[PDB]
Amino acid sequence: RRMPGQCSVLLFPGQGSQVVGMGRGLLNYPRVRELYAAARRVLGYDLLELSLHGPQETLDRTVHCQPAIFVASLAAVEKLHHLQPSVIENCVAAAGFSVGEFAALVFAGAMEFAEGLYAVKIRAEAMQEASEAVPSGMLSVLGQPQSKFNFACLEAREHCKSLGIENPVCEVSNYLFPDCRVISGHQEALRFLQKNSSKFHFRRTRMLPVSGAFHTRLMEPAVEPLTQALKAVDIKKPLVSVYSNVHAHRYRHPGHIHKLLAQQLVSPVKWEQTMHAIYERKKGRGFPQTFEVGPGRQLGAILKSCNMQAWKSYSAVDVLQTLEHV
RNA sequence: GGACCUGGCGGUGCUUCAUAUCCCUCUAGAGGAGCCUGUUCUGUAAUCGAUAAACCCCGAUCAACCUCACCACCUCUUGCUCAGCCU
Ligand SMILES: [Mg+2]
Ligand SMILES: [Mg+2]
């Protein structure tokens, strides 16, 4: 039973980490060019060019960002394996945020690159369709000890009930760290929350630049397409402990990933609970190494907020440049 | 009829101070978030109940298709060992 400090935990990012220049610093590393070639073969366009140099507005579109993040995450895993083989050898857990979950399974030997990427493509397209279906959006909110989230959601619904719309949606969509949440639903609700922050005791409020209300019932139309896409795919037993976003626990048997991966589409993301499940321990016990295989450093900040002692042994795989030309 | 005595109130309050423990003041930290437990109401035919008996092979852990426990149907019979149960 290895001492905590030798083992490693891989964290895969999700929506919102896209950035122009993604992939440079990973191409010359082994087996990455072939991965982008397979991405071309499956998608139908050149992901490599878009990630390397793109207008950032095409890259911000839902149909493109998710496959880009998936491919970049797996390329970063390849680079980390090249630099530090022991880190990949001694892996105890894996977790992804929204679409990075699909990456984690592929890293865990539960899926393959082609099938996983096809699933991600169908997911992104279906979500975009549902986003045009009804106007919707996402809002990140940081609260105080006096802040009531469900309560604020209730009046956020009361306003647009007074306006008049069918079963208005405004619910907490992402649990990411203490007192910081992301609420999802109609624009008028989130607009109401912005201007009643002071009443609702919100320190900060920031609209997420996303197309629609992810992880809510508004994305119900996108469940059935993705559902079909996962039937042909044969998921195996994950080799490492992969943690889910619906209920924030390990995937225990392969016969339930099929339905959890579709329930995630319309269920809040339990990221705080996943961090607690992976890192919570008695004071004085050591923590594992943590590697954010993928673009950005957001999960690093979220881990810093969630658990400082775990964050002390955190590092990120850089996907925008490389120190040595391999 | 006269004189005297004991008393008893398991009694009643107040006064002053010793009045330390206990106070009161005074000093220094302990509410939000996520999980797990206690109680209540509601609900089920039924137990969101337990692992000298699973899983895991960082810590812990939830339900695990482990297994025991509960509910609804059945089967076995002199059987394991003049058996068997932690009742
Ligand atoms: Mg039970
Ligand atoms: Mg028994």
UniProtKB/Swiss-Prot annotation:
The modification N6-succinyllysine is found at K259. Belongs to the type II malonyltransferase family. Keywords: Disease variant, Fatty acid biosynthesis, Fatty acid metabolism, Lipid biosynthesis, Lipid metabolism, Mitochondrion, Transferase, Transit peptide. It catalyses: holo-[ACP] + malonyl-CoA = malonyl-[ACP] + CoA. Its EC number is 2.3.1.39. It comes from Homo sapiens (Human). It is found in: Mitochondrion. This is Malonyl-CoA-acyl carrier protein transacylase, mitochondrial. The chain holds residues 56 to 381 of 390 of the full protein.
